[PDB]
Amino acid sequence: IVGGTASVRGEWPWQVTLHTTSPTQRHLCGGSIIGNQWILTAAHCFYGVESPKILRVYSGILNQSEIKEDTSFFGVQEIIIHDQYKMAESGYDIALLKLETTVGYGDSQRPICLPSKGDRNVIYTDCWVTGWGYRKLRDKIQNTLQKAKIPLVTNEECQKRYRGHKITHKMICAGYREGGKDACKGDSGGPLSCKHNEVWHLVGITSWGEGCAQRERPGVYTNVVEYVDWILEKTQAV
Ligand SMILES: COC(=O)Nc1ccc(-c2[nH]c([C@H](CC(=O)N3CCOCC3)NC(=O)/C=C/c3cc(Cl)ccc3-n3cnnn3)nc2Cl)cc1
């Protein structure tokens, strides 16, 4: 997160830190709890990941120092990547991780509400990008979960800012025309949470951008309202 501040413990209880074991343990991506055995993250997070066996989900974490050999986690039973996903810059940069065990909801961890089918009509003023990502393009993973308020940008305006790209309606952009606040290396997969009618909704998944918080370069997210059916099809399998 560029131009953010430290979170208060329990602010984003749906927020998780997805770690890899191969070769060494280290943070891989962000993610969101959407069900008692479901985490929604970015499909690009599993580039090169050959087995769910090397993954660990840590919920109820404010600081990365909280993760030690004795820290409890969730094992990944299954990695479900959107089967139309080729690359972040094309879209379908969404994946589900089915956990081996049940997340027990409490004061440190709970799910985030997905956008409703009728929520496509609403305008979001209160949106926030969260992660343990870099504060700048050449940095390191942050210990304390940063938070940043970013305005949502139109498809038309985002398309103007990304000449040479193809900004689909399956994509959602957020940025200040002058930059300063955005997501960065280490934040992907993580949420773009919007508070509407005093309820937080998972409006986006941190995906890609050209550099970090550059003027006239909004960060691009997976427009989650366009994937509610896929998420339900994959989480609600008979
Ligand atoms: C000790 O542990 C560690 O050090 N762990 C560690 C873990 C992961 C990373 C890391 N993560 C990423 C991914 C892309 C990726 O993982 N890949 C690999 C797979 O193919 C796609 C790229 N991008 C993002 O997360 C966000 C992009 C972004 C998003 C928005 Cl909204 C706006 C601007 C954005 N940025 C434009 N440039 N930087 N950020 N790159 C790096 Cl490098 C670095 C370190």
PDB file of N, CA, C and O and ligand atoms in Angstrom, residues 26-28 44 47 134 137 141 182-188 206-209 211-212 219-221, ligand 1:
ATOM      1  N   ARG A  26       7.104 -17.354   3.262  1.00  0.00           N
ATOM      2  CA  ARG A  26       6.986 -15.932   2.980  1.00  0.00           C
ATOM      3  C   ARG A  26       5.579 -15.653   2.500  1.00  0.00           C
ATOM      4  O   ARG A  26       4.946 -16.514   1.884  1.00  0.00           O
ATOM      5  N   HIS A  27       5.117 -14.414   2.748  1.00  0.00           N
ATOM      6  CA  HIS A  27       3.857 -13.878   2.282  1.00  0.00           C
ATOM      7  C   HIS A  27       3.852 -14.001   0.758  1.00  0.00           C
ATOM      8  O   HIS A  27       4.891 -13.796   0.115  1.00  0.00           O
ATOM      9  N   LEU A  28       2.700 -14.366   0.186  1.00  0.00           N
ATOM     10  CA  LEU A  28       2.520 -14.530  -1.254  1.00  0.00           C
ATOM     11  C   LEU A  28       1.522 -13.496  -1.809  1.00  0.00           C
ATOM     12  O   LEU A  28       1.840 -12.796  -2.767  1.00  0.00           O
ATOM     13  N   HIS A  44      -3.613 -14.959 -10.352  1.00  0.00           N
ATOM     14  CA  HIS A  44      -2.159 -14.776 -10.590  1.00  0.00           C
ATOM     15  C   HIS A  44      -1.312 -15.099  -9.389  1.00  0.00           C
ATOM     16  O   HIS A  44      -0.095 -15.143  -9.512  1.00  0.00           O
ATOM     17  N   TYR A  47       0.669 -18.469  -9.768  1.00  0.00           N
ATOM     18  CA  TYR A  47       1.599 -18.631 -10.893  1.00  0.00           C
ATOM     19  C   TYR A  47       2.810 -19.466 -10.390  1.00  0.00           C
ATOM     20  O   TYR A  47       3.536 -19.040  -9.485  1.00  0.00           O
ATOM     21  N   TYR A 134       4.234  -3.506  -0.537  1.00  0.00           N
ATOM     22  CA  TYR A 134       5.264  -2.474  -0.537  1.00  0.00           C
ATOM     23  C   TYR A 134       4.648  -1.091  -0.377  1.00  0.00           C
ATOM     24  O   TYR A 134       3.497  -0.902  -0.761  1.00  0.00           O
ATOM     25  N   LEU A 137       7.433   1.024  -5.317  1.00  0.00           N
ATOM     26  CA  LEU A 137       7.820  -0.006  -6.297  1.00  0.00           C
ATOM     27  C   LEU A 137       9.091  -0.811  -5.937  1.00  0.00           C
ATOM     28  O   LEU A 137       9.172  -2.005  -6.247  1.00  0.00           O
ATOM     29  N   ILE A 141       7.842  -6.199   2.040  1.00  0.00           N
ATOM     30  CA  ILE A 141       6.534  -6.533   2.633  1.00  0.00           C
ATOM     31  C   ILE A 141       6.436  -5.819   3.999  1.00  0.00           C
ATOM     32  O   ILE A 141       7.403  -5.851   4.773  1.00  0.00           O
ATOM     33  N   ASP A 182      -2.479   4.046  -3.571  1.00  0.00           N
ATOM     34  CA  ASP A 182      -2.752   2.866  -4.408  1.00  0.00           C
ATOM     35  C   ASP A 182      -2.221   1.584  -3.720  1.00  0.00           C
ATOM     36  O   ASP A 182      -1.633   1.634  -2.640  1.00  0.00           O
ATOM     37  N   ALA A 183      -2.443   0.438  -4.370  1.00  0.00           N
ATOM     38  CA  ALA A 183      -1.956  -0.862  -3.961  1.00  0.00           C
ATOM     39  C   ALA A 183      -0.592  -1.027  -4.631  1.00  0.00           C
ATOM     40  O   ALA A 183      -0.243  -0.265  -5.533  1.00  0.00           O
ATOM     41  N   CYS A 184       0.196  -1.979  -4.166  1.00  0.00           N
ATOM     42  CA  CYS A 184       1.525  -2.213  -4.701  1.00  0.00           C
ATOM     43  C   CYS A 184       1.886  -3.675  -4.531  1.00  0.00           C
ATOM     44  O   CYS A 184       1.059  -4.450  -4.057  1.00  0.00           O
ATOM     45  N   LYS A 185       3.121  -4.062  -4.938  1.00  0.00           N
ATOM     46  CA  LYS A 185       3.664  -5.428  -4.852  1.00  0.00           C
ATOM     47  C   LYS A 185       3.427  -6.008  -3.479  1.00  0.00           C
ATOM     48  O   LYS A 185       3.978  -5.504  -2.514  1.00  0.00           O
ATOM     49  N   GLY A 186       2.588  -7.030  -3.405  1.00  0.00           N
ATOM     50  CA  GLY A 186       2.302  -7.772  -2.179  1.00  0.00           C
ATOM     51  C   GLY A 186       0.866  -7.704  -1.729  1.00  0.00           C
ATOM     52  O   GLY A 186       0.457  -8.453  -0.841  1.00  0.00           O
ATOM     53  N   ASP A 187       0.095  -6.799  -2.354  1.00  0.00           N
ATOM     54  CA  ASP A 187      -1.301  -6.526  -2.034  1.00  0.00           C
ATOM     55  C   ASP A 187      -2.296  -7.351  -2.836  1.00  0.00           C
ATOM     56  O   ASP A 187      -3.408  -7.590  -2.349  1.00  0.00           O
ATOM     57  N   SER A 188      -1.899  -7.823  -4.033  1.00  0.00           N
ATOM     58  CA  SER A 188      -2.796  -8.581  -4.922  1.00  0.00           C
ATOM     59  C   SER A 188      -3.515  -9.688  -4.252  1.00  0.00           C
ATOM     60  O   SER A 188      -2.968 -10.289  -3.334  1.00  0.00           O
ATOM     61  N   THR A 206      -7.531  -6.887  -5.450  1.00  0.00           N
ATOM     62  CA  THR A 206      -6.332  -6.190  -5.945  1.00  0.00           C
ATOM     63  C   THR A 206      -5.650  -7.024  -7.060  1.00  0.00           C
ATOM     64  O   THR A 206      -5.213  -8.144  -6.810  1.00  0.00           O
ATOM     65  N   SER A 207      -5.559  -6.465  -8.284  1.00  0.00           N
ATOM     66  CA  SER A 207      -5.022  -7.183  -9.438  1.00  0.00           C
ATOM     67  C   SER A 207      -3.689  -6.639 -10.009  1.00  0.00           C
ATOM     68  O   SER A 207      -2.653  -7.287  -9.844  1.00  0.00           O
ATOM     69  N   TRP A 208      -3.729  -5.511 -10.736  1.00  0.00           N
ATOM     70  CA  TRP A 208      -2.557  -4.953 -11.409  1.00  0.00           C
ATOM     71  C   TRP A 208      -2.687  -3.435 -11.606  1.00  0.00           C
ATOM     72  O   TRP A 208      -3.754  -2.877 -11.374  1.00  0.00           O
ATOM     73  N   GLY A 209      -1.605  -2.808 -12.071  1.00  0.00           N
ATOM     74  CA  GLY A 209      -1.525  -1.382 -12.376  1.00  0.00           C
ATOM     75  C   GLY A 209      -0.184  -1.074 -12.998  1.00  0.00           C
ATOM     76  O   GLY A 209       0.711  -1.917 -12.944  1.00  0.00           O
ATOM     77  N   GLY A 211       2.957   0.609 -12.451  1.00  0.00           N
ATOM     78  CA  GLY A 211       3.713   1.177 -11.335  1.00  0.00           C
ATOM     79  C   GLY A 211       2.818   1.237 -10.103  1.00  0.00           C
ATOM     80  O   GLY A 211       1.731   0.669 -10.113  1.00  0.00           O
ATOM     81  N   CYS A 212       3.246   1.918  -9.034  1.00  0.00           N
ATOM     82  CA  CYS A 212       2.418   2.068  -7.833  1.00  0.00           C
ATOM     83  C   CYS A 212       2.078   3.547  -7.647  1.00  0.00           C
ATOM     84  O   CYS A 212       2.961   4.379  -7.818  1.00  0.00           O
ATOM     85  N   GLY A 219      -5.259   1.871 -10.116  1.00  0.00           N
ATOM     86  CA  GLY A 219      -5.041   0.463  -9.875  1.00  0.00           C
ATOM     87  C   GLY A 219      -6.267  -0.238 -10.405  1.00  0.00           C
ATOM     88  O   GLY A 219      -7.360   0.316 -10.311  1.00  0.00           O
ATOM     89  N   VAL A 220      -6.084  -1.441 -10.996  1.00  0.00           N
ATOM     90  CA  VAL A 220      -7.128  -2.278 -11.584  1.00  0.00           C
ATOM     91  C   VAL A 220      -7.395  -3.505 -10.714  1.00  0.00           C
ATOM     92  O   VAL A 220      -6.472  -4.211 -10.271  1.00  0.00           O
ATOM     93  N   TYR A 221      -8.693  -3.707 -10.446  1.00  0.00           N
ATOM     94  CA  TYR A 221      -9.249  -4.733  -9.586  1.00  0.00           C
ATOM     95  C   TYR A 221     -10.215  -5.596 -10.361  1.00  0.00           C
ATOM     96  O   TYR A 221     -10.695  -5.183 -11.404  1.00  0.00           O
TER      97      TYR A 221
HETATM   98  C1  LIG B   1       8.957 -11.777   2.204  1.00  0.00           C
HETATM   99  O1  LIG B   1       7.862 -12.032   1.289  1.00  0.00           O
HETATM  100  C2  LIG B   1       7.839 -11.280   0.179  1.00  0.00           C
HETATM  101  O2  LIG B   1       8.681 -10.456  -0.104  1.00  0.00           O
HETATM  102  N1  LIG B   1       6.705 -11.554  -0.523  1.00  0.00           N
HETATM  103  C3  LIG B   1       6.226 -10.896  -1.697  1.00  0.00           C
HETATM  104  C4  LIG B   1       5.025 -11.367  -2.220  1.00  0.00           C
HETATM  105  C5  LIG B   1       4.529 -10.856  -3.407  1.00  0.00           C
HETATM  106  C6  LIG B   1       5.188  -9.830  -4.075  1.00  0.00           C
HETATM  107  C7  LIG B   1       4.680  -9.325  -5.368  1.00  0.00           C
HETATM  108  N2  LIG B   1       3.349  -9.417  -5.709  1.00  0.00           N
HETATM  109  C8  LIG B   1       3.206  -8.966  -6.983  1.00  0.00           C
HETATM  110  C9  LIG B   1       1.927  -8.989  -7.769  1.00  0.00           C
HETATM  111  C10 LIG B   1       2.112  -9.566  -9.177  1.00  0.00           C
HETATM  112  C11 LIG B   1       2.543 -11.017  -9.238  1.00  0.00           C
HETATM  113  O3  LIG B   1       2.631 -11.691  -8.217  1.00  0.00           O
HETATM  114  N3  LIG B   1       2.752 -11.553 -10.464  1.00  0.00           N
HETATM  115  C12 LIG B   1       3.265 -12.902 -10.706  1.00  0.00           C
HETATM  116  C13 LIG B   1       2.288 -13.672 -11.556  1.00  0.00           C
HETATM  117  O4  LIG B   1       2.008 -13.014 -12.786  1.00  0.00           O
HETATM  118  C14 LIG B   1       1.522 -11.692 -12.546  1.00  0.00           C
HETATM  119  C15 LIG B   1       2.505 -10.884 -11.749  1.00  0.00           C
HETATM  120  N4  LIG B   1       1.301  -7.669  -7.833  1.00  0.00           N
HETATM  121  C16 LIG B   1       0.599  -7.209  -6.779  1.00  0.00           C
HETATM  122  O5  LIG B   1       0.528  -7.850  -5.724  1.00  0.00           O
HETATM  123  C17 LIG B   1      -0.041  -5.882  -6.950  1.00  0.00           C
HETATM  124  C18 LIG B   1      -0.006  -5.099  -8.031  1.00  0.00           C
HETATM  125  C19 LIG B   1      -0.612  -3.770  -8.202  1.00  0.00           C
HETATM  126  C20 LIG B   1      -1.985  -3.645  -8.009  1.00  0.00           C
HETATM  127  C21 LIG B   1      -2.593  -2.422  -8.188  1.00  0.00           C
HETATM  128 CL1  LIG B   1      -4.297  -2.265  -7.856  1.00  0.00          CL
HETATM  129  C22 LIG B   1      -1.876  -1.309  -8.572  1.00  0.00           C
HETATM  130  C23 LIG B   1      -0.506  -1.414  -8.752  1.00  0.00           C
HETATM  131  C24 LIG B   1       0.127  -2.642  -8.585  1.00  0.00           C
HETATM  132  N5  LIG B   1       1.514  -2.746  -8.889  1.00  0.00           N
HETATM  133  C25 LIG B   1       2.200  -2.496 -10.011  1.00  0.00           C
HETATM  134  N6  LIG B   1       3.454  -2.794  -9.820  1.00  0.00           N
HETATM  135  N7  LIG B   1       3.539  -3.232  -8.538  1.00  0.00           N
HETATM  136  N8  LIG B   1       2.383  -3.208  -7.958  1.00  0.00           N
HETATM  137  N9  LIG B   1       4.370  -8.565  -7.468  1.00  0.00           N
HETATM  138  C26 LIG B   1       5.272  -8.788  -6.480  1.00  0.00           C
HETATM  139 CL2  LIG B   1       6.933  -8.419  -6.717  1.00  0.00          CL
HETATM  140  C27 LIG B   1       6.369  -9.333  -3.528  1.00  0.00           C
HETATM  141  C28 LIG B   1       6.894  -9.870  -2.365  1.00  0.00           C
END
